[PDB]
PDB file of C-alpha atoms and ligand atoms in Angstrom:
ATOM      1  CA  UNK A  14     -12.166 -22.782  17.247  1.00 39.82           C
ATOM      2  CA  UNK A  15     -11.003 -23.659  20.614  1.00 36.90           C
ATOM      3  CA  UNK A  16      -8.307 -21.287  20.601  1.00 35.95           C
ATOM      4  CA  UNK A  17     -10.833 -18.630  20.433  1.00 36.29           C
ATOM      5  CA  UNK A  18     -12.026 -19.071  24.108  1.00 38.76           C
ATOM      6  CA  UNK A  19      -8.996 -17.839  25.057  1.00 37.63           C
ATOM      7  CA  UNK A  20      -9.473 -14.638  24.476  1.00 36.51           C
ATOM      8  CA  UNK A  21     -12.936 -13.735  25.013  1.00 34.06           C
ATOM      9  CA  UNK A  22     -11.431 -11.525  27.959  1.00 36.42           C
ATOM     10  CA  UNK A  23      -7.863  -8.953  28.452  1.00 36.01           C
ATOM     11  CA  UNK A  24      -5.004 -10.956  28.004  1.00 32.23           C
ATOM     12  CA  UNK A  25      -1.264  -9.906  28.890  1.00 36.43           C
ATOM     13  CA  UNK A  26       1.005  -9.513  26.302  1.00 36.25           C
ATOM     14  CA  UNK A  27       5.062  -9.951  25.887  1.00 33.84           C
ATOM     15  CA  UNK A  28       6.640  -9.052  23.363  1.00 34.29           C
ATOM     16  CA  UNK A  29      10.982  -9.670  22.843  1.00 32.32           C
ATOM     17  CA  UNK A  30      12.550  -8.127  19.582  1.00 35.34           C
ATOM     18  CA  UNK A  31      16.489  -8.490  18.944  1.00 33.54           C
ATOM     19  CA  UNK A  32      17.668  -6.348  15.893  1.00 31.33           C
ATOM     20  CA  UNK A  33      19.820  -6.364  13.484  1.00 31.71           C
ATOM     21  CA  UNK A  34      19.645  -3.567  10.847  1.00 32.79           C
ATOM     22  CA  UNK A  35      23.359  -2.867   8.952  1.00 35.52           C
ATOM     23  CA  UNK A  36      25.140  -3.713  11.599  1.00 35.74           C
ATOM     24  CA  UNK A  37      23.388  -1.740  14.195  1.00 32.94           C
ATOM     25  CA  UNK A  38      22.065  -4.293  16.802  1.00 34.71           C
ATOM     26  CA  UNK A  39      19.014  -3.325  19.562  1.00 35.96           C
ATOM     27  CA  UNK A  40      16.657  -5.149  21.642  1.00 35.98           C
ATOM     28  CA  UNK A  41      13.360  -4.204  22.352  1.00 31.66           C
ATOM     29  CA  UNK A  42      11.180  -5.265  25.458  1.00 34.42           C
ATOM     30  CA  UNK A  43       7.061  -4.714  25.318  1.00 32.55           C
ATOM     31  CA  UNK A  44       4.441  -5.258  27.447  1.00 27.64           C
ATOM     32  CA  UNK A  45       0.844  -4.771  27.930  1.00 25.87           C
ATOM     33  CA  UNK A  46      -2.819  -6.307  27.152  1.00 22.01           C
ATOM     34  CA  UNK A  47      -5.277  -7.234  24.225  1.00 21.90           C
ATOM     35  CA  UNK A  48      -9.068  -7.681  24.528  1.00 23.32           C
ATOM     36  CA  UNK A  49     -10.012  -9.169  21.248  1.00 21.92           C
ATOM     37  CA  UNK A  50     -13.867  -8.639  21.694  1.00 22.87           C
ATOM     38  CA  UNK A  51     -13.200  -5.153  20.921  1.00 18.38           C
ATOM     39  CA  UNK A  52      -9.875  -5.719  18.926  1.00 16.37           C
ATOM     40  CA  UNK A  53      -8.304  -3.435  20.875  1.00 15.78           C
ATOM     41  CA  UNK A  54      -4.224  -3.365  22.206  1.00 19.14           C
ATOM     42  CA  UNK A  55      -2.563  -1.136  24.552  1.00 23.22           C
ATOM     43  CA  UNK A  56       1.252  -1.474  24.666  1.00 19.73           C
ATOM     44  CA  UNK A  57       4.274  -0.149  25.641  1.00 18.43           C
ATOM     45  CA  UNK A  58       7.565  -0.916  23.979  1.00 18.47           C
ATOM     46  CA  UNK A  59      11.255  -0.232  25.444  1.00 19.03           C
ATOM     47  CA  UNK A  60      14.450  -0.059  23.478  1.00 18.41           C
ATOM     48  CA  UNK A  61      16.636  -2.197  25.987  1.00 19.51           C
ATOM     49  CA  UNK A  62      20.037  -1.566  24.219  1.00 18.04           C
ATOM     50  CA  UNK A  63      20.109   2.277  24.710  1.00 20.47           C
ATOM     51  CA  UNK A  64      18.807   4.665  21.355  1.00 20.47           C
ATOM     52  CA  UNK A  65      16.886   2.597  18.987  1.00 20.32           C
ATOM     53  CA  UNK A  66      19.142   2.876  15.777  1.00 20.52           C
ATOM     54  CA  UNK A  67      15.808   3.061  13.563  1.00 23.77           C
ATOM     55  CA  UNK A  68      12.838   4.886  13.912  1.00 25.40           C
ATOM     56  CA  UNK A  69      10.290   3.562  15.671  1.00 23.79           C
ATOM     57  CA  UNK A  70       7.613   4.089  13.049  1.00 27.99           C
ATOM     58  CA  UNK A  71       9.081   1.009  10.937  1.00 23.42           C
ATOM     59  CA  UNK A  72       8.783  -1.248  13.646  1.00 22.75           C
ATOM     60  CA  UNK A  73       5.238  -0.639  14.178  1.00 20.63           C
ATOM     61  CA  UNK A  74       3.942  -3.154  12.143  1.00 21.68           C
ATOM     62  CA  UNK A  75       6.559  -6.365  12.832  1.00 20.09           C
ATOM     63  CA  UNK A  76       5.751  -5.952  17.341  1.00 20.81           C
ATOM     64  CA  UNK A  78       0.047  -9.991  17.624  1.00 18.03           C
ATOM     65  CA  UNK A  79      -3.043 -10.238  15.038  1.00 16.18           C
ATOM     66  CA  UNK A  80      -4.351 -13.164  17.075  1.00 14.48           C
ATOM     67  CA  UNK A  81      -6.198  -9.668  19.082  1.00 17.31           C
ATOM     68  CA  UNK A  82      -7.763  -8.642  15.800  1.00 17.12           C
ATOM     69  CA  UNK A  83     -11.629  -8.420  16.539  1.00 19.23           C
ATOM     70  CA  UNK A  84     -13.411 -10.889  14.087  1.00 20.43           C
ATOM     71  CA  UNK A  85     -17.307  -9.717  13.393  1.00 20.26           C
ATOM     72  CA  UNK A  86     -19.509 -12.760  14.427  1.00 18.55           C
ATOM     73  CA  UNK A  87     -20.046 -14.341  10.642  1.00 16.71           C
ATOM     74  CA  UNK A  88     -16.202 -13.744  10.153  1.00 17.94           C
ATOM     75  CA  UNK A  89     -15.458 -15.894  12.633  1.00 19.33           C
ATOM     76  CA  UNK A  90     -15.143 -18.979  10.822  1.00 21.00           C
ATOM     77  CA  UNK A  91     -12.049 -17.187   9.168  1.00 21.66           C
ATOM     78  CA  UNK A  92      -9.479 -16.418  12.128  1.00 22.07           C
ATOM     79  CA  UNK A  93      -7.101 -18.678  11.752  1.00 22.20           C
ATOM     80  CA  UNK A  94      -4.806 -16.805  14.523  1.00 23.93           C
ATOM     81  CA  UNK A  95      -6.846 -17.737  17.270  1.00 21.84           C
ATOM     82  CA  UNK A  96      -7.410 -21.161  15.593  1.00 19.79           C
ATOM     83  CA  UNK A  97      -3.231 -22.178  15.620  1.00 20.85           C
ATOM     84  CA  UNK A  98      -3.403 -20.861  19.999  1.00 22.10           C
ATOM     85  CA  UNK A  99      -2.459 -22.259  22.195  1.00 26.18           C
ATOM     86  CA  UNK A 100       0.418 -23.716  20.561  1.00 22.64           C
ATOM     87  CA  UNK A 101       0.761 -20.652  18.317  1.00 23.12           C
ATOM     88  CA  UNK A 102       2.211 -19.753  14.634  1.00 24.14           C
ATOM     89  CA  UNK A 103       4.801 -18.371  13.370  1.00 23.37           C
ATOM     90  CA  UNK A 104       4.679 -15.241  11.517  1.00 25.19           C
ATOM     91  CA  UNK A 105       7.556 -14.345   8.573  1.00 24.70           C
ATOM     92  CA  UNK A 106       7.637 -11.098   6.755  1.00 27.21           C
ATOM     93  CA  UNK A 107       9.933  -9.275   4.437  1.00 26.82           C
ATOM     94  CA  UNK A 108       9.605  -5.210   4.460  1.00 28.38           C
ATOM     95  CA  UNK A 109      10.775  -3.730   1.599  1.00 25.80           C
ATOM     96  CA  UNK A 110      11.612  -0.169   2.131  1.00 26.87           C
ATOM     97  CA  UNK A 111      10.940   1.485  -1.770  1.00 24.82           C
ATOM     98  CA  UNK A 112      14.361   3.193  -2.403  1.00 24.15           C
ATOM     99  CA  UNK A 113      16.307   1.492   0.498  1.00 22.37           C
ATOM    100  CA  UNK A 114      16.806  -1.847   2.583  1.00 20.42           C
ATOM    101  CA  UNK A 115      14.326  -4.238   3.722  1.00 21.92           C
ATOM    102  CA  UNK A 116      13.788  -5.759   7.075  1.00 22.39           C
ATOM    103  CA  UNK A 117      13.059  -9.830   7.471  1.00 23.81           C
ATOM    104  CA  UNK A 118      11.711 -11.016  10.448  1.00 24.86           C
ATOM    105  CA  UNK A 119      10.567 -14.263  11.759  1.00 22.04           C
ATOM    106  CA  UNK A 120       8.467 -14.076  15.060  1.00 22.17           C
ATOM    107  CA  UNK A 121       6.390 -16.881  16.791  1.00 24.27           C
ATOM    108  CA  UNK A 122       3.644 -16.093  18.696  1.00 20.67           C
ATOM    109  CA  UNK A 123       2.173 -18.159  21.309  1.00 22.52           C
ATOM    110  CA  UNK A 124       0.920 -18.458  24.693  1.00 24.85           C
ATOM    111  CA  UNK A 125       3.312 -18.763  27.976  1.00 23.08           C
ATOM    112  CA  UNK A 126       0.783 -19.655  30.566  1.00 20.51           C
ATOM    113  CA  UNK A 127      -2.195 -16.668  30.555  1.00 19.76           C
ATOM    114  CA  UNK A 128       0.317 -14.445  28.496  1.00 23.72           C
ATOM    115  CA  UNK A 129       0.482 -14.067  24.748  1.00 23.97           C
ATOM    116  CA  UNK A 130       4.236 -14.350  23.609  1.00 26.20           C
ATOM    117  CA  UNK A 131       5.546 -12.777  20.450  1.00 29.12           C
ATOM    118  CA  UNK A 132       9.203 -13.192  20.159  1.00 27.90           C
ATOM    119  CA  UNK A 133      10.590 -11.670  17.295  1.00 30.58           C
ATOM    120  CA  UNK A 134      13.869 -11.763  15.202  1.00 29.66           C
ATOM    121  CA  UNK A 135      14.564  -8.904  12.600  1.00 31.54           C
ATOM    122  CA  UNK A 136      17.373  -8.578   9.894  1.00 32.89           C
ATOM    123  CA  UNK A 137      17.705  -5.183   8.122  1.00 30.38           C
ATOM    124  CA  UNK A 138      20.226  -5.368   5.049  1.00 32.41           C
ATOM    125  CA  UNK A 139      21.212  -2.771   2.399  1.00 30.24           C
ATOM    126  CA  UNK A 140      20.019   0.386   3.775  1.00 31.20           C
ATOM    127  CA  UNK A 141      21.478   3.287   2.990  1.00 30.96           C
ATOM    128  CA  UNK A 142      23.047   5.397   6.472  1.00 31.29           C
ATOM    129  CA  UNK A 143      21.548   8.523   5.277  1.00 32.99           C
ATOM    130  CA  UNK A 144      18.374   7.361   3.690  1.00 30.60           C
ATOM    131  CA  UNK A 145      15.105   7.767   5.438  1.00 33.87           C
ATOM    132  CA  UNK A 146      15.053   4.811   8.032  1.00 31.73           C
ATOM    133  CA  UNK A 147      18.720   5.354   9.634  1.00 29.92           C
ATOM    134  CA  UNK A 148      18.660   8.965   9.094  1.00 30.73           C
ATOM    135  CA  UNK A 149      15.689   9.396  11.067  1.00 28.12           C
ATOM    136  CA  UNK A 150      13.389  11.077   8.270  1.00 27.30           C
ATOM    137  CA  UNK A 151      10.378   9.232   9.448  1.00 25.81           C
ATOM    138  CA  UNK A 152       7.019  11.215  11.129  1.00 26.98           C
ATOM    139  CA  UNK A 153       5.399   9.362  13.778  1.00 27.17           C
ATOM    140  CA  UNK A 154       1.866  10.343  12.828  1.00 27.87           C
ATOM    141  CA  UNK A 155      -0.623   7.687  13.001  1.00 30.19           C
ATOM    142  CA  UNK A 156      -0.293   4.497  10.701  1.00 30.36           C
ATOM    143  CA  UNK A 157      -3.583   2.779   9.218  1.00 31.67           C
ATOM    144  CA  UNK A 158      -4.131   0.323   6.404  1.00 32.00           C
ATOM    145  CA  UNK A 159      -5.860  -3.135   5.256  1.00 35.26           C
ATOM    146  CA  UNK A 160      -3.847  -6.426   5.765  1.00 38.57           C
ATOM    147  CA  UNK A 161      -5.162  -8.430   2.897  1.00 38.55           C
ATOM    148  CA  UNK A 162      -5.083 -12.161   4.286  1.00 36.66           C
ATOM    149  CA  UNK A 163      -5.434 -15.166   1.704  1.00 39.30           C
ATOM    150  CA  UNK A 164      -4.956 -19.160   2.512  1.00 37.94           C
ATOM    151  CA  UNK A 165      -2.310 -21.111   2.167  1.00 36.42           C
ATOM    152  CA  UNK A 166      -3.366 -24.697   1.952  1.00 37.73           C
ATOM    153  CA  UNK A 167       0.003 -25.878   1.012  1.00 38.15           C
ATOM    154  CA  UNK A 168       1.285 -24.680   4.513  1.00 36.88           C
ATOM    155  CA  UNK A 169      -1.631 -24.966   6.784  1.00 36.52           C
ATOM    156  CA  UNK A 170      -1.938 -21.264   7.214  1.00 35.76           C
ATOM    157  CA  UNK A 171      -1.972 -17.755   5.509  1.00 35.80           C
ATOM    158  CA  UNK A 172      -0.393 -15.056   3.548  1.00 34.97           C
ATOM    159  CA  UNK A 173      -0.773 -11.836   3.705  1.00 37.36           C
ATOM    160  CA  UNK A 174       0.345  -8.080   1.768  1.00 36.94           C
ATOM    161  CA  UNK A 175      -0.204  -4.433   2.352  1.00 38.06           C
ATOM    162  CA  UNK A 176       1.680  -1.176   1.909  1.00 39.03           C
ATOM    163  CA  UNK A 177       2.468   1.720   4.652  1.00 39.28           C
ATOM    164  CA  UNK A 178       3.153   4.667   3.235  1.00 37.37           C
ATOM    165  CA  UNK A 179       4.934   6.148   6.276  1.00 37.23           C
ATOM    166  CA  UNK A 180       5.020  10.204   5.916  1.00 40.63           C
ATOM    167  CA  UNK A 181       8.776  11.776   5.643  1.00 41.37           C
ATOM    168  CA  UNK A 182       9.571  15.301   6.499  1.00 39.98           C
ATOM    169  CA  UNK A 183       9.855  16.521   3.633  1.00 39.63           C
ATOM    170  CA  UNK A 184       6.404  16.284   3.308  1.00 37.96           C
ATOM    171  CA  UNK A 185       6.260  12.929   0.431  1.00 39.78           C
ATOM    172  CA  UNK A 186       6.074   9.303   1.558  1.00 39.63           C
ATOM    173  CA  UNK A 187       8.517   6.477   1.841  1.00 36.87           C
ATOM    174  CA  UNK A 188       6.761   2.805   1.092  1.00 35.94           C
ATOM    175  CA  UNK A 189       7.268   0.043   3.276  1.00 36.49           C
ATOM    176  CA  UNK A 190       5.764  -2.837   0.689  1.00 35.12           C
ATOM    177  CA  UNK A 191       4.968  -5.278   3.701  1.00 33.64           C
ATOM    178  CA  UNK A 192       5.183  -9.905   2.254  1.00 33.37           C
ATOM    179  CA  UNK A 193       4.088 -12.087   4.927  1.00 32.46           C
ATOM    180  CA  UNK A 194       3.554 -15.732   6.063  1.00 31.16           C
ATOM    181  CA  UNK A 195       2.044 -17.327   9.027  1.00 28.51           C
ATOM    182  CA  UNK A 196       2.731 -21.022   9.683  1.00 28.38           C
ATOM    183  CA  UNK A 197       0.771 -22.762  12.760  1.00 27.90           C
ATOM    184  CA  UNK A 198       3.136 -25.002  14.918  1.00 27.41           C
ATOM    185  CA  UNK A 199       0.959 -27.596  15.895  1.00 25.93           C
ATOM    186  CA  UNK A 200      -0.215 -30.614  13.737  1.00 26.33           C
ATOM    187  CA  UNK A 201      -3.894 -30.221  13.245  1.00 24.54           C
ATOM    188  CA  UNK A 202      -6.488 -28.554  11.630  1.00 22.15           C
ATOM    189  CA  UNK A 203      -6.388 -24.441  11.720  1.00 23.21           C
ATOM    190  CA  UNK A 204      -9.387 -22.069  10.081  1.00 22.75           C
ATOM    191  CA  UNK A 205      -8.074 -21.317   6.801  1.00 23.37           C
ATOM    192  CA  UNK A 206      -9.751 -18.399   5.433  1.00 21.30           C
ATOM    193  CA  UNK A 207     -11.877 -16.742   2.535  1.00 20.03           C
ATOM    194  CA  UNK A 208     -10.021 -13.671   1.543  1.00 17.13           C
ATOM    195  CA  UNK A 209     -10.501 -10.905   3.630  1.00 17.72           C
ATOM    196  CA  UNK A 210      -8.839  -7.915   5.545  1.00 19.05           C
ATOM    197  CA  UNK A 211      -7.906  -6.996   8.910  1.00 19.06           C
ATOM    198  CA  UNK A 212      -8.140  -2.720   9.162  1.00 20.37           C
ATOM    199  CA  UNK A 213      -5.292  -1.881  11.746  1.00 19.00           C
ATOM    200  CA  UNK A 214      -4.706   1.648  13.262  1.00 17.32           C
ATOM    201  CA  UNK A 215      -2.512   2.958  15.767  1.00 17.55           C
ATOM    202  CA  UNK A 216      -1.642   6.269  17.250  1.00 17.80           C
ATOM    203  CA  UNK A 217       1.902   6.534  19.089  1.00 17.59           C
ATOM    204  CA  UNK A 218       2.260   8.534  22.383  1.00 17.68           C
ATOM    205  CA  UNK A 219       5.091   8.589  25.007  1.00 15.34           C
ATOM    206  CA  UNK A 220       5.084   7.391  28.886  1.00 21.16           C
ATOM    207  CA  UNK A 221       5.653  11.055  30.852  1.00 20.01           C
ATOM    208  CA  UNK A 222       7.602   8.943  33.408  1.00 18.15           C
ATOM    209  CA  UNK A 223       9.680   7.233  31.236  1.00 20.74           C
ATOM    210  CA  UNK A 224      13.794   8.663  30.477  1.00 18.14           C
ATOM    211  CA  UNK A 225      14.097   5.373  28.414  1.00 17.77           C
ATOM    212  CA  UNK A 226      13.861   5.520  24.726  1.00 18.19           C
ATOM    213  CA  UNK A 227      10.715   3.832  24.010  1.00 14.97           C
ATOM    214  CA  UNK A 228       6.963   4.013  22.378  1.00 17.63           C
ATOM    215  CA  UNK A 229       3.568   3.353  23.878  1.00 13.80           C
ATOM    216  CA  UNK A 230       1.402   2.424  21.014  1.00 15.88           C
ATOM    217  CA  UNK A 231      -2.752   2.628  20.906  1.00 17.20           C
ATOM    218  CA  UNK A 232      -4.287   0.040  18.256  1.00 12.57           C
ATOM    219  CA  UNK A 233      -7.297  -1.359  16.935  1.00 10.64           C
ATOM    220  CA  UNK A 234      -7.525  -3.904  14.541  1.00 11.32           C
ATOM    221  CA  UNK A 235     -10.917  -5.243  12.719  1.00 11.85           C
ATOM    222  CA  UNK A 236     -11.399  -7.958  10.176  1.00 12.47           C
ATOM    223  CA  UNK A 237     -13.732  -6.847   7.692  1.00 11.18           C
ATOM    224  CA  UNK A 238     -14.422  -7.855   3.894  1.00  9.48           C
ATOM    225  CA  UNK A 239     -17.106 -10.094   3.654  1.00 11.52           C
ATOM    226  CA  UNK A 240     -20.526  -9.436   4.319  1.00 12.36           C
ATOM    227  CA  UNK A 241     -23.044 -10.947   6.259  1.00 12.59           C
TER     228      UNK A 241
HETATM  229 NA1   NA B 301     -11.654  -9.945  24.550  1.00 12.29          NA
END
């Protein structure tokens, strides 16, 4: 695709969240760069609102797989790239097992030389002293398979894939992930063969920083089909 020239090099990245989860409203700001040839992001993400009223593990996955690294004979199959520069938009529902869910609608494309994710999420029915707003979450490193299928009917994709984000008390709370991607422009897009993208992360913290934020590590690999 065209849109794949575009990131052959390291690319800024801007990413605007605004919140809504029972009632509890928060912005979040990020900013950093993506070099797709080695599928690799390095971002940091500010709560702009004060205390983020959720834990920042189960926003991981909603603040860009237009970075993911596509092997060579894969590359047929990224439709991400494909939908740039006009971009896509990307819908999800989260379903928390046990508690609320989170539905977000983001679209994602380039402002100039910087990739643009602006995001909208809507948390209903959780519970205020359930795992996500009582803060039960660990913030150990999140991994997992995206598993991507076409959508002819809407010019794009779908995907699914479970995080099974570690609480305290030493079990796991399931975050059963739905989502869409849409392109915005008119034409053509690479719609793919069923495959996977293999996304991991590990979360640190700025030393600097008396914000309440998250600087996130993450690599993310389509895989699935062989050669
Ligand atoms: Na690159």
């Amino acid at each position: 695709s065209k849109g794949e020239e575009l990131f052959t090099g390291v690319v800024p990245i801007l990413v605007e969240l605004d919140g809504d989860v029972n009632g509890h409203k928060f912005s979040v700001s990020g900013e950093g760069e993506g070099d797709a040839t080695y599928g690799k992001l390095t971002l940091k993400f500010i709560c702009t609102t004060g205390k983020l009223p959720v834990p920042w593990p189960t926003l991981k996955t909603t603040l860009v797989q237009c970075f993911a690294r596509y092997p060579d004979h894969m590359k047929q199959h990224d439709f991400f790239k494909s939908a740039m520069p006009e971009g896509y938009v990307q819908e999800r529902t989260i379903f928390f097992k046990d508690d609320g869910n989170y539905k977000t609608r983001a679209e994602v494309k380039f402002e100039g030389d910087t990739l643009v994710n602006r995001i909208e999420l809507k948390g209903i029915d959780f519970k205020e002293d359930g795992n996500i707003l009582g803060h039960k979450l660990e913030y150990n490193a999140i991994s997992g398979n995206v598993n991507i299928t076409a959508d002819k009917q809407k010019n794009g994709i779908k995907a699914n894939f479970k995080i099974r984000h570690n609480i305290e008390d030493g079990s796991v709370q399931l975050a059963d992930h739905y989502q869409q991607n849409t392109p915005i422009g008119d034409g053509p897009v690479l719609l793919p063969d069923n495959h996977y993208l293999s996304t991991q992360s590990k979360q640190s913290k700025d030393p600097n920083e008396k914000r309440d934020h998250m600087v996130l590590l993450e690599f993310v690999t389509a895989a699935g089909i062989t050669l």
